[PDB]
Design a protein around this nucleic acid. Structure first.
Ligand SMILES: [Mg+2]
Ligand SMILES: [Mg+2]
Ligand SMILES: [Mg+2]
Ligand SMILES: [Mg+2]
Ligand SMILES: [Mg+2]
Ligand SMILES: [Mg+2]
Ligand SMILES: [Mg+2]
Ligand SMILES: [Mg+2]
Ligand SMILES: [Mg+2]
Ligand SMILES: [Mg+2]
Ligand SMILES: [Mg+2]
Ligand SMILES: [Mg+2]
Ligand SMILES: [Mg+2]
Ligand SMILES: [Mg+2]
Ligand SMILES: [Mg+2]
Ligand SMILES: [Mg+2]
Ligand SMILES: [Mg+2]
Ligand SMILES: [Mg+2]
Ligand SMILES: [Mg+2]
Ligand SMILES: [Mg+2]
Ligand SMILES: [Mg+2]
Ligand SMILES: [Mg+2]
Ligand SMILES: [Mg+2]
Ligand SMILES: [Mg+2]
Ligand SMILES: [Mg+2]
Ligand SMILES: [Mg+2]
Ligand SMILES: [Mg+2]
Ligand SMILES: [Mg+2]
Ligand SMILES: [Mg+2]
Ligand SMILES: [Mg+2]
Ligand SMILES: [Mg+2]
Ligand SMILES: [Mg+2]
Ligand SMILES: [Mg+2]
Ligand SMILES: [Mg+2]
Ligand SMILES: [Mg+2]
Ligand SMILES: [Mg+2]
Ligand SMILES: [Mg+2]
Ligand SMILES: [Mg+2]
Ligand SMILES: [Mg+2]
Lengths: 193, 58, 148, 51, 203, 99
RNA sequence: UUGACCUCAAAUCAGGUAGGAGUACCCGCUGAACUUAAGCAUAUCAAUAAGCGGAGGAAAAGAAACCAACCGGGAUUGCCUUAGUAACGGCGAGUGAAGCGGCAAAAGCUCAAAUUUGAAAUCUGGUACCUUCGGUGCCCGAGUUGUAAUUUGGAGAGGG
RNA sequence: GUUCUUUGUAAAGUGCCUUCGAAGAGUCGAGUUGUUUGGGAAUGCAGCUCUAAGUGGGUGGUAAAUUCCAUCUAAAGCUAA
RNA sequence: UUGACAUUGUGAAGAGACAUAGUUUC
């Protein structure tokens, strides 16, 4: 049961796998049902747009942080700098998130400006009876796109202080490598009687 | 909270109260707060004067 | 499709191509990777040297993307400017106006040295450079701007 | 769970239908295909948008 | 209030006053029937923070469950199979003894719904529990928007499905990397990992 | 913090104009209180010392705060609760059978 | 002598509820061996079959004692991926998840712990009438060993 | 869409000053045993013994002691897609 | 079957340490 020169496959079908096969024969079916779902909802939902306003947010870790991406809710701080409370902003189609914090002003302002533009570009019908029929825009995400902030200019003067970049990394790497030791030698040499 | 706020001038504590825990700390509390207290026979008799079946304290 | 299969061609010949002597049985070698150290070892060393035993350190809970560092040689570099914008910059190779190439924004983590860029000055912003990659950038009168 | 549908690369898919459109001229093919076209004026056959 | 002292007092189980109490009560409980209705919470602070309220429709029940391991029943210890399965004596039973306590009363009151339970006493032979229940057909509970969720039929015999707080513990339902195997619920998440997902245009 | 601005090194990270947001109360969950300080001090002189606590302070006085910790680490969970327990006992002694 | 109280009883006492069925899917318990390893016990089959308890139209999960280590993200569920990877393993046969990223759907919250103390403000039941999925008047009853309002950490509370 | 009652000397939101800020225990946690997991000086679960704290507690995928840092807030609860 | 821990409490005599006051353990 081993022969010729062939990659070594690892195919896990030693359990009763035929029992657990899922063939999505209903792809087309469930896409229709999802289109009908959205349609039925957009009708129930009055001119309201099917989705809620979402904040700009910087994506985690080292791999994704370069990109900015839509977050969950707006951080009680950002909601407050835009001059409305949490409770009311939820009724307005703004998503609020008590868990997210602002350590970064540039993003903080982006979300307050996002809240500003949203408030301007919506109309909130009176409590009374009237309902002055307004023709739903279906998105918020499309009306209020989330775009990558521009970090620089195309061309600009070359400034070389001649410090080698690379070896500025070589050295930054080292200072952290030996930071612990060279503190122990500071401890140990303070003990000079 | 009365005893804690020193507003009580007399506290009557029952000798009953089967979860005796509800009460036992009151002698200490009344002492530390300077409130005079007394342990009264009849948790149910504390009730009658207060229009309950059993009052456990008055 | 089945009509092109060679089992259609075998109909009428007793043994289905499987031999009269040695037949087609269930699992003569055993099943799967059985015997990699015994009857199947001549095939394992030769075609799979190194299969058995360990090497090196275990790493518990090692998340790829900690190590994410796509690599881009000077071999390309300039490809990170759209060609219309690109040709404009090659001519007028200069200080005071030199193209800024954000390689992080392009999806790369390190710039290596494969070789030969023209003499146009460039401002290259990257997380990491090979030593030769940066020397070459300098020899065209550009620099590297370390970003994060 | 037998394979029922088949994936075709979008581009070659297009190449195919492009090829198929280009052959709806070429009356020899339309003729070879069935399609009684001897009695029609010209191919491609374009008709008023009023249709 | 009084409840803050009871809480702090109860955290001294080895204190001289509480282990006189512990010693007298555990004799009384052991005289009574293994399931017997409790007139009031003997820990009105504990019942209180578990959802109890003193109002018509809330029932308190006291139950004994024998301590120790589950001896795998099996005739004469004979296991008939591989030796890794040969064990009889050291096997531990994935559900808590408190889970068993809820289940046995929850059966004895079939019309009630088990809300929560709490530990009261134990000797070497028994652990003692007070189970707090609710009558879902009592109108004080059917009104009262706070508690009438218990009336919906999804909550029939929550303690037999592991939906009480203890059942949730032993089901291992908690967020994060320590609960991966049992979170969305263990057999379901197993089945997910072991399902073959075949699309129409095969990926 | 002030990130350096490079992708390795000590404070490695991108420089950003920073904020320091408003503190959450859920960060103060440990905080004592005037309410619970009183109750716990009160129940302590109600219920007194536990068996392992008596043998702990007599161990302290007659052995000291090293062998104490070593015992209380076996008794309690581990070495830090044993630290903080012996200290709680030191202040049982000092504040009482002394000053 | 009489009247309560605590706890425990009995009624063909007034009104209710539970059982059994089904069980494709769902929440749990319990639990194999054939098999694979070319033999075999650890392993595998499999946290599978059979056995037991319990729900629904979905069940369960769910507003973080989470993920992360970033310029950080932000309930749960699911799909595409992560990945046949990190890891487990007579490190043999074999096994094998998670974080990030895209998409589907989106939704949030309430108690315990607080003196209403210038007024238990709360509630089941009976009963009469009424505009009866209920309301109101009145009486038993519950309940201070705590029923309402108030507050739930994102807070929030007492003052001014 | 209409139309009858105004619920109210009721209820709710917001700015500043000040004082506070109650927050779940035979639990968390530890040892040991058994089971289970990819989880590896121990992933979860359970038995028995031990059993906390309040600038505390939990986690941070190599055991330990020391020093810091980050991140949440357990041992009670409801909830559509 | 044997040991330890738990269920496990009250006296008294005698051994046992801070090293010949009594909290403690057999
Ligand atoms: Mg598979
Ligand atoms: Mg199907
Ligand atoms: Mg949507
Ligand atoms: Mg209207
Ligand atoms: Mg084929
Ligand atoms: Mg042939
Ligand atoms: Mg032939
Ligand atoms: Mg052949
Ligand atoms: Mg033959
Ligand atoms: Mg032969
Ligand atoms: Mg190998
Ligand atoms: Mg009653
Ligand atoms: Mg068997
Ligand atoms: Mg085994
Ligand atoms: Mg429902
Ligand atoms: Mg697993
Ligand atoms: Mg009757
Ligand atoms: Mg049934
Ligand atoms: Mg088979
Ligand atoms: Mg075999
Ligand atoms: Mg064989
Ligand atoms: Mg055999
Ligand atoms: Mg298994
Ligand atoms: Mg197994
Ligand atoms: Mg079955
Ligand atoms: Mg069944
Ligand atoms: Mg039904
Ligand atoms: Mg549905
Ligand atoms: Mg919360
Ligand atoms: Mg999430
Ligand atoms: Mg392998
Ligand atoms: Mg397995
Ligand atoms: Mg809590
Ligand atoms: Mg088992
Ligand atoms: Mg284990
Ligand atoms: Mg440590
Ligand atoms: Mg964070
Ligand atoms: Mg509740
Ligand atoms: Mg639930």
């Amino acid at each position: 049961a081993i022969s010729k020169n062939l990659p070594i496959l690892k195919n896990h079908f030693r359990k009763h796998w035929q029992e657990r096969v899922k063939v999505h024969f209903d792809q087309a079916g469930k896409k229709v049902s999802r289109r009908n779902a959205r349609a039925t909802r957009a009708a129930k939902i009055a001119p309201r747009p099917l989705d809620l306003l979402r904040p700009v947010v910087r994506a985690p870790t080292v791999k994704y942080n370069r990109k900015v991406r839509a977050g969950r809710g707006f951080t009680l701080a950002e909601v407050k700098a835009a001059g409305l409370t949490a409770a009311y902003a939820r009724t307005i189609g703004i998503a609020v998130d008590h868990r997210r914090q602002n350590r970064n002003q540039e993003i903080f302002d982006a979300n307050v400006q996002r809240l500003k533009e949203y408030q301007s570009k919506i109309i909130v019908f009176p409590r009374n009876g009237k309902a002055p029929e307004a023709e739903q825009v279906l998105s918020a995400a499309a009306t209020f796109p989330i775009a990558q902030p521009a970090t620089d200019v195309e061309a600009r003067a070359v400034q070389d202080n001649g410090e080698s970049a690379f070896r500025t990394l070589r050295l930054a790497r080292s200072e952290k490598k030996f930071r612990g030791i060279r503190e122990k030698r500071a401890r140990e040499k303070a003990e000079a009687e | 909270a009365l005893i804690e706020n020193k507003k009580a001038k007399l506290v009557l504590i029952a000798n009953d109260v089967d979860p005796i825990e509800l009460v036992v700390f009151l002698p200490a509390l009344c002492k530390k707060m300077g409130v005079p207290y007394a342990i009264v026979k009849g948790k149910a008799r504390l009730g009658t004067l207060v229009n309950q079946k059993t009052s456990a304290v008055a | 499709p089945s009509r092109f299969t060679k089992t259609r061609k075998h109909r009428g010949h007793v043994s289905a191509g499987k031999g009269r002597i040695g037949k087609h049985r269930k699992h003569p070698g055993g099943r799967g990777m059985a015997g990699g150290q015994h009857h199947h070892r001549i095939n394992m060393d030769k075609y799979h040297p190194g299969y058995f035993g360990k090497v090196g350190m275990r790493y518990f809970h090692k998340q790829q993307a900690h190590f994410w560092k796509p690599v881009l040689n000077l071999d390309k570099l300039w490809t990170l400017i759209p060609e219309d914008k690109r040709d404009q910059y090659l001519k007028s190779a200069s200080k005071e106006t030199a193209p800024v190439i954000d390689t992080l924004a392009a999806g790369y983590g390190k710039i290596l040295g494969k070789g030969r860029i023209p003499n146009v000055p460039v401002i290259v912003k990257a997380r990491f450079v090979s030593k030769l990659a940066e020397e070459k950038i300098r020899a065209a009168g550009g620099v590297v701007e370390l970003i994060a | 769970w037998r394979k029922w549908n088949v994936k075709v690369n979008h581009n070659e898919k297009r190449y195919a239908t492009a090829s198929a459109i280009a052959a709806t001229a070429v009356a020899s093919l339309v003729l070879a295909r069935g399609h009684r076209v001897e009695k029609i004026p010209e191919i491609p056959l374009v008709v008023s948008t009023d249709l | 209030g009084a409840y803050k002292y009871l809480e702090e007092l109860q955290r001294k189980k080895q204190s001289d006053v509480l282990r006189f109490l512990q010693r007298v009560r555990v004799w009384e409980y052991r005289q009574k029937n293994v399931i017997h209705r409790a007139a009031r919470p003997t820990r009105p602070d504990k019942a209180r923070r578990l959802g109890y309220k003193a109002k018509q429709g809330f029932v308190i029940y006291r139950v004994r469950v024998r301590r120790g391991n589950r001896k795998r029943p099996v005739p004469k210890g004979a296991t008939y199979g591989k030796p890794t399965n040969q064990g009889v004596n050291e096997l531990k039973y994935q559900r808590s003894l408190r889970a068993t306590a809820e289940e046995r009363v929850g059966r004895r009151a079939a019309n009630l719904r088990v809300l929560n339970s709490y530990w009261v006493n134990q000797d070497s032979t028994y652990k003692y529990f007070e189970v707090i229940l609710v009558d879902p057909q009592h109108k004080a509970i059917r009104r009262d928007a706070r508690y009438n969720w218990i009336c919906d039929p999804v909550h029939k015999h929550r303690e037999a499905r592991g939906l009480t707080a203890t059942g949730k513990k032993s089901r291992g339902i908690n967020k994060g990397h320590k609960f991966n195997n049992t979170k969305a619920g263990r057999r379901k998440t197993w089945k997910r990992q072991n399902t073959l997902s075949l699309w129409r245009y095969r990926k | 913090t002030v990130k350096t601005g490079i992708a390795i090194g000590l404070n490695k990270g991108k420089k950003v104009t920073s904020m320091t947001p408003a503190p959450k109360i859920s960060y103060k969950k440990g905080a004592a209180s005037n309410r619970t300080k009183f109750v716990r001090s009160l129940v302590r002189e109600i219920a007194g010392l536990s068996p392992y606590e008596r043998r702990l302070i007599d161990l302290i006085r007659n052995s000291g705060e090293k062998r104490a910790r070593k015992v209380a680490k076996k008794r309690l969970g581990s070495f830090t609760r044993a630290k903080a327990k012996v200290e709680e006992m030191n202040n049982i002694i000092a504040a009482s059978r002394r000053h």
